[PDB]
Amino acid sequence: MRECISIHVGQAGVQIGNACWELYCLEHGIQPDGQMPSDKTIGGGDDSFNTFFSETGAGKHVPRAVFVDLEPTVIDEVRTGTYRQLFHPEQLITGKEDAANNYARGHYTIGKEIIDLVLDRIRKLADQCTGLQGFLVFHSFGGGTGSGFTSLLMERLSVDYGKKSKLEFSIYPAPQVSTAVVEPYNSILTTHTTLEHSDCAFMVDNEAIYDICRRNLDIERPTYTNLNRLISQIVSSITASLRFDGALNVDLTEFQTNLVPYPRIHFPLATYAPVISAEKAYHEQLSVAEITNACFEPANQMVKCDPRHGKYMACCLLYRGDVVPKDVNAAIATIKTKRSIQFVDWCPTGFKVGINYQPPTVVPGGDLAKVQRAVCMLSNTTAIAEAWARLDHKFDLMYAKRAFVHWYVGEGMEEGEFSEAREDMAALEKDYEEVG
Amino acid sequence: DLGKKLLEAARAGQDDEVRILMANGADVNATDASGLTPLHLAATYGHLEIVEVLLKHGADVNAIDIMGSTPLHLAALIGHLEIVEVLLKHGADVNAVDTWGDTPLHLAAIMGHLEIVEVLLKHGADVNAQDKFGKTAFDISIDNGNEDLAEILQK
Amino acid sequence: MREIVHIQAGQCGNQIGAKFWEVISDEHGIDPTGSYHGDSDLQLERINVYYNEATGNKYVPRAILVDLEPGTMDSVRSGPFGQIFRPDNFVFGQSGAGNNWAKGHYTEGAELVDSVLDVVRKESESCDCLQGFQLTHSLGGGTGSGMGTLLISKIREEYPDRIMNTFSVMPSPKVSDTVVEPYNATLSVHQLVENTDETYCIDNEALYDICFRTLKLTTPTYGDLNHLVSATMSGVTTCLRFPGQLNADLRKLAVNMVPFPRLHFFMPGFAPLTSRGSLTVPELTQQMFDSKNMMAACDPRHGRYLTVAAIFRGRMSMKEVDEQMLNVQNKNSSYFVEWIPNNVKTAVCDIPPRGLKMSATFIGNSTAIQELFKRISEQFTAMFRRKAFLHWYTGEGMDEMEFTEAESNMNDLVSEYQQYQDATAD
Ligand SMILES: Nc1nc2c(ncn2[C@@H]2O[C@H](COP(=O)(O)OP(=O)(O)OP(=O)(O)O)[C@@H](O)[C@H]2O)c(=O)[nH]1
Ligand SMILES: Nc1nc2c(ncn2[C@@H]2O[C@H](COP(=O)(O)OP(=O)(O)OP(=O)(O)O)[C@@H](O)[C@H]2O)c(=O)[nH]1
Ligand SMILES: COc1ccc(/N=N/c2cc(OC)c(OC)c(OC)c2)cc1O
Ligand SMILES: [Ca+2]
Ligand SMILES: [Mg+2]
Ligand SMILES: [Mg+2]
């Protein structure tokens, strides 16, 4: 058992973190006060759930997690909510004034007032670990805290924890539910400065999640609560291998080995199926072949892009529930007889398979129906460069006029940092083109 | 030099002092360094009684300063309706043009003195007079979206 | 980001300022004595933004009242909410400014500026996390214009990291036919371009035009004009005062609305327009973007919107608002710049204002505001070319070059708006 520390930064990282830890508690049988009646060893242990939960001498199971925000409103909802007793009170850190949707404020001026405290609190959690493997960092691209503070934090974690892995869950902006006009700027600045410090990053496109809520769940105008419950389902599917027994992606290093062929193209695409509305409680149960075919349909992706336009470098299928391995083998065999699934010539055309035989858990109050089998596909495809081009174009339209740039320069940032960031993105776009 | 004291009295509105200076030979048509006369000053500062007194004692109602401003241009710019009427009754040139191509009509239209605009039009002000930029008083009303002024100019 | 320190200077500033406090106190359930008589819990959630909590659960406005004319304090005191203001917060001189910007800025006003700053310090030091400041004032007089700009500059030196926001009333000969008002407004605009983060442009020309042509009032009074001002000030401060799905503050409004530092002059709008003592979502979205509903006498169809923020108030389908707002941006596509993606932001607030079930407030940063600046510039130049009344200013220690510098800066501002109105994405 090797521990993982989760770090939740800014409103999006915090709200998604709350929804994830609620789901993890229901999956492991942990009550909101921290008690776990199925844990026979009190005061400690080396079980797979111990990667995410420490234990006190009183039998309390505490998340290995830190919540950080530059203003207190969002974190105050965690301090007074259903799971208020679950977290270490010193694990919830708040400033007084936020970054005002400005990367430079989060990174250079306001963020510097709290960075040392956050590192000292992370150190206290790291000291309790027998074999810390690394960090899971949750944040938006668009917020000033989510972009700027996360970059500053990732730079410091690389100095103090050199050999540890760092994985991100990043929220990519969408016009339908965005906060600020400058989100494309923040997104490009944080991508540039974090690239060399992150080993693997799972982007969640708010527009993709918004469309799934509208289409599959019949939600007319989805809110952050609806988006976060679906996102937490997907995040749980991705982290399940770290928290339960299994033979695939069993540690952070394995995510890099399986999904990241080269350090800069470290952005896997996640696909999830099936998403069925809770109002359809008596739905027909979809077979392994149906849910597996559903992973190759663009409508089910976590990022809007078209994998038919790109080439695959890796593909992992993570099943949960009533799934017979020979049915997976037959379903995959049928997928290989489809011309719209091309791998790069330098990678073996194989699919890696992991099966957890417990079906997914539904959260009371959620929008999802219970299902007997579900799948999360993680793939590294060159088609994700389409997401980068869309963001790069919105950056170029404003930057060509230097619109809003004065707000960043006025907060201790040089104007040349914008050009250095954009050039890094042009090279990242070329890295995908060079693979194919 | 009574002309210098007459310029000061006309600007300050000292009626008694104006009568006294005139009685002692003061030049009613004296000029300051920029060519302004006692009549230009009384019309700029709204001293109606001084304007009438000077006009009955040989003041040139159409005197121009170094910028071509007449007392009528200044009265129309500042908005002294009663002075505009007295100047017109005494022979002021309604279509006098200054160094900027402006007529009294242009200045009253710019400053929004609508009652003065009506008086000028009734006395034969030229609606086709263009300033050095080619603008008539109607062009000014259109370019600034002054519907009230544009209606008056069409009447 | 919580507390705002409000300052009101001169006659216009204090009259519109008193009306602001009366309107928002009624919305927040605050009576003229300072007690909370409301029913909704949403009224006290962000009350701290404008009010200080005091003994016996008494809510006192974080307001400073300034004027060189002592008679203004009495008119304010004689008002309904005149006793709610803190007696220590009234700073009043002996002689007015007589519409002389130089008296407000350099002589009478400069003697009284340290006294006001003492009160600002006392109010600021009692704030847990001060956002910034809001000033109400006219630009045509001498105190609100000359002294107001001096106060903005001195506050700026002491609090350079806080936001400075003004509600500045632009002069018009239709309401006040005083020929020195273009001088005072031009000298003020020169200061506002450099020293404020955001300015709501409230134009007496548009206020008069709305009363006369739309409300059919033959002889509009200050009370009729100020009714439009208070509805606008209530509308644009909605999200600072009510929770909503956004945690708005003055700095987030500035970062998202101001793409170029000098272009921080907003054109506010309001729908429906009503007179004193006297609707669907598609109609509200329509009226909101109409020239007749703008508080600045500019046709937005003569320029381009760089950024827009809209606030809808009342009970309505949030999906319908998204649909109508999407529709207006498609059919009026040539009136928005193409190089600032997603430049229109909407917010919905459950609590509507007094006497209305539905209301919409518009905050535009449009290149068409150059029409307001050109109107004042043409009047300034007509007076300035003849040097009319210049001695009234130079006699108070003002150099003649200060006028030339203000005129040049305003014409430069107009050229800057024209530059972005003609810019294309390609
Ligand atoms: N999916 C999801 N997106 C969110 C959530 N909260 C905010 N966002 C998105 O995150 C972006 C805004 O960044 P935030 O996280 O709110 O900002 P922040 O990190 O707190 O930064 P500042 O408030 O600027 O200091 C926008 O693109 C929002 O749509 C959330 O709970 N879920
Ligand atoms: N909308 C509106 N405009 C007003 C009001 N009071 C004055 N004004 C305008 O404000 C300008 C004159 O400014 P005032 O506020 O009267 O002057 P002040 O700031 O007190 O300055 P001094 O009297 O010169 O010391 C003119 O353009 C008036 O039309 C009011 O209550 N509402
Ligand atoms: C063009 O993009 C944007 C522009 C403005 C943005 N929001 N700004 C606010 C701030 C407010 O506080 C005063 C509001 O109260 C009046 C407010 O009411 C709706 C919005 C956010 C943006 O992404
Ligand atoms: Ca145990
Ligand atoms: Mg935030
Ligand atoms: Mg006054």
3-state per-residue secondary structure call for chain C: CCCEEEEEEHHHHHHHHHHHHHHHHHHCCECCCCCECCCCHHHCCCHHHCEEEECCCEEEECEEEEECCCHHHHHHHCCCCCCCCCHHHEEECCCCCCCCHHHHHCCHHHHHHHHHHHHHHHHHHCCCCCCEEEEEEECCCCHHHHHHHHHHHHHHHHCCCCEEEEEEEECCCCCCCCCCHHHHHHHHHHHHHHHCCEEEEEEHHHHHHHHHHHCCCCCCCHHHHHHHHHHHHHHHHHHHHCCCCCCCCHHHHHHHHCCCCCCCEEEEEEECCCCCCCCCHHHHHHHHCCHHHECCCCCHHHCCEEEEEEEEECCCCHHHHHHHHHHHHHHCHHHECCCCCCCEEEEEECCCCCCCCCEEEEEEEEHHHHHHHHHHHHHHHHHHHCCCCCHHHHCCCCCCHHHHHHHHHHHHHHHHHHHHHCCCCC
* Count of Cβ atoms closer than 10 Å to residue C39 Cβ: 7
CA pair distance C24, C354, nearest whole angstrom: 10
In the 8-state DSSP scheme, what is residue A361? P
C143 CA to middle of ligand 6, Å?
A: 7
Which residue lies with its CA nearest to atom 27 of ligand 2? C171
Task: Record the tokens describing residue A386, joined without a space.
Answer: 């389409």
Cβ-contact C404, C187 below 8 angstroms: no
CA pair distance B32, B46, nearest whole angstrom: 18
All domains of chain A in start order, with CATH:
1-268 (3.40.50.1440), 269-383 (3.30.1330.20), 384-436 (1.10.287.600)
Cβ-contact C67, C10 below 8 angstroms: yes
CA pair distance A69, A139, nearest whole angstrom: 10
CA pair distance A365, C185, nearest whole angstrom: 59
Does an H or E element contain A53, and which? strand A53-55
Cβ-based neighbours of A159, under 8 Å, separated by 6 or more: none
End-to-end CA distance of chain A: 38
- Report the CATH number at residue B93: 1.25.40.20
CA pair distance C380, C405, nearest whole angstrom: 12
Cβ distance of C339 and A403 shorter than 8 Å: yes
CA distance, residue C207 to nearest chain B CA (Å): 14
| Resolution attained, angstroms | 1.8
Atom of ligand 1 lying closest to residue A142 CA? 11
Cβ-contact A381, A310 below 8 angstroms: yes
Ligand nearest to C-alpha C146: 2
Plot region of A319 (φ>0 → left; ψ -120 to 50 → alpha; else → beta): beta
Considering only alpha carbons, which residue of chain A is nearest residue C423? Answer: A401
Helices then strands, each counted (H, E), chain B? 10, 0
Asked if C307 has any chain A CB less than 8 Å from its own CB, the reply is: yes
CATH 3.40.50.1440 holds for C2-259: yes
Cβ-contact C171, C182 below 8 angstroms: yes
At A58 the three-state DSSP class reads coil
Cβ distance of C375 and B100 shorter than 8 Å: no
End-to-end CA distance of chain B: 50
Side chain identity at C44, as an amino acid letter?
L
Cβ-contact A100, C257 below 8 angstroms: no
Of the candidates C384, C380, C378, C381, the residue with the CA atom closest to the CA atom of residue C400: C384
CA pair distance A358, A241, nearest whole angstrom: 12
CA pair distance C322, C345, nearest whole angstrom: 10
Please report how many Cα atoms fall inside a 13 Å half-sphere around the Cα of residue A89, on the Cβ side.
2
CA pair distance B3, A426, nearest whole angstrom: 79
Of the candidates C174, C158, C242, the residue with the CA atom closest to the CA atom of residue C210: C174
Cβ-contact A135, A197 below 8 angstroms: no
B145 CA to middle of ligand 6, Å?
A: 29
Cβ-contact C203, C296 below 8 angstroms: yes
Residue A222 Cβ inside 6 Å of ligand 1? The answer reads no
Task: Record the tokens describing residue A17, joined without a space.
Answer: 């973190």
Considering only alpha carbons, which residue of chain C is nearest residue A98? Answer: C1
CA distance, residue C254 to nearest chain B CA (Å): 29
Cβ distance of B67 and C386 shorter than 8 Å: yes
Burial C227-265 (b: 16+ CB within 10 A, else e): bbbbbbbbbbbbbbbbebeebbbbbbbbbbbbbbeebbb
Side chain identity at C269, as an amino acid letter?
G
Residues 44-83 of A with CB under 8 A from C: 71, 73
Residue A203 Cβ inside 6 Å of ligand 1? The answer reads no
CA pair distance A251, A232, nearest whole angstrom: 20
Chain B with chain C: Cβ pairs closer than 8 A: 44
Task: Record the tokens describing residue C59, joined without a space.
Answer: 């809510």
> Architecture of C369-426 per CATH?
Orthogonal Bundle (1.10)
CA pair distance C152, C170, nearest whole angstrom: 17
Asked if C194 has any chain B CB less than 8 Å from its own CB, the reply is: no
- What are residue A139's phi and psi, to 5 degrees? -165, 155
Burial B76-107 (b: 16+ CB within 10 A, else e): bbbbbeebbbbbbebebbbebbbebebbbbbb
State which fold the C260-368 domain adopts: 60s Ribosomal Protein L30; Chain: A; (3.30.1330)
In the 8-state DSSP scheme, what is residue A368? B
> By residue range, what is the domain housing residue B122?
1-155
Plot region of A314 (φ>0 → left; ψ -120 to 50 → alpha; else → beta): beta
Cβ-contact B112, C177 below 8 angstroms: yes
**Catalytic annotation on A433?**
no
CA C351 to chain centre: 22
Active-site choice (A27, A254, A417, A429) = A254
At A170 the three-state DSSP class reads strand
CA A363 to chain centre: 19
At B91 the three-state DSSP class reads coil
Asked if C343 has any chain A CB less than 8 Å from its own CB, the reply is: yes
Cβ distance of C173 and B74 shorter than 8 Å: no
Q: Which residues of C are annotated as a binding site for Mg(2+)?
A: 69
CA pair distance C83, C34, nearest whole angstrom: 9
Cβ-contact A351, A320 below 8 angstroms: no
Ligand nearest to C-alpha C255: 3
Of the candidates C290, C289, C264, C275, the residue with the CA atom closest to the CA atom of residue C417: C264
Cβ-contact B34, B65 below 8 angstroms: yes
Side chain identity at A95, as an amino acid letter?
G
Of the candidates A250, A157, A249, A263, the residue with the CA atom closest to the CA atom of residue A200: A263
CA distance, residue A407 to nearest chain C CA (Å): 7
CA pair distance A237, A376, nearest whole angstrom: 6
A75 CA to middle of ligand 2, Å?
A: 46
Residues 226-245 of C with CB under 8 A from B: none
Residue C147 Cβ inside 6 Å of ligand 2? The answer reads no
CA pair distance A250, A244, nearest whole angstrom: 9
Cβ-contact B92, B99 below 8 angstroms: no
Residue numbers in A near C322 (CB within 8 A):
221
Cβ-contact B8, B16 below 8 angstroms: no
CA pair distance A93, A82, nearest whole angstrom: 19
How far lies B53's CA from each of B22, B59, B92, C279, C293, in Å?
Answer: 10, 9, 16, 63, 50
When divided into structural domains, chain B yields a total of 1
Q: C51-58: which pairs have CB atoms within 8 A and are 24 or more residues apart?
A: C52/C123, C52/C126, C58/C34
CA pair distance C22, C14, nearest whole angstrom: 12
Residue ranges matching CATH 3.40.50.1440 in chain C: 2-259
Please report how many Cα atoms fall inside a 13 Å half-sphere around the Cα of residue A407, on the Cβ side.
28
Which residue lies with its CA nearest to atom 6 of ligand 2? C12
CA distance, residue C302 to nearest chain B CA (Å): 11
Cβ-contact A249, A360 below 8 angstroms: no
Residue ranges matching CATH 1.10.287.600 in chain C: 369-426
Cβ-contact C25, C43 below 8 angstroms: no
Residue A178 Cβ inside 6 Å of ligand 1? The answer reads yes
Cβ-contact A25, A156 below 8 angstroms: no
In the 8-state DSSP scheme, what is residue B155? -
Task: Record the tokens describing residue A128, joined without a space.
Answer: 């309790």
Peptide bond into A274 cis (omega under 30): yes
Cβ-based neighbours of C70, under 8 Å, separated by 6 or more: C92, C93, C94
The CA R_g of chain B, rounded to the nearest whole Å, is: 16
Residue A158 Cβ inside 6 Å of ligand 1? The answer reads no
> Cα angle vertex B43, ends B37, B46, to 5°?
140
Cβ-contact A23, A363 below 8 angstroms: yes
CA pair distance A100, C231, nearest whole angstrom: 27
A133 CA to middle of ligand 4, Å?
A: 19
End-to-end CA distance of chain C: 39
Side chain identity at B21, as an amino acid letter?
L
CA pair distance B38, B7, nearest whole angstrom: 5
* Count of Cβ atoms closer than 10 Å to residue B33 Cβ: 6
Dihedral (CA of A31, A33, A34, A38) sign: negative
Please report how many Cα atoms fall inside a 13 Å half-sphere around the Cα of residue C122, on the Cβ side.
13
CA pair distance A115, C37, nearest whole angstrom: 44
Residue C224 Cβ inside 6 Å of ligand 2? The answer reads no
**Strand ranges (DSSP E) for A198-305?**
200-205, 269-273
Report the DSSP pairing between strands C132-138 and C265-271.
unpaired
At A434 the three-state DSSP class reads helix
Question: Sheet of A4-9: strands edge to edge?
Answer: A92-94, A65-69, A4-9, A134-140, A165-172, A200-205
CA pair distance B134, C400, nearest whole angstrom: 29
Cβ-contact B65, B40 below 8 angstroms: yes
Question: Sheet of C90-92: strands edge to edge?
Answer: C90-92, C63-67, C4-9, C132-138, C163-170, C198-203, C265-271, C359-366, C305-313, C344-349
CA pair distance A37, A31, nearest whole angstrom: 9
* Count of Cβ atoms closer than 10 Å to residue B41 Cβ: 24
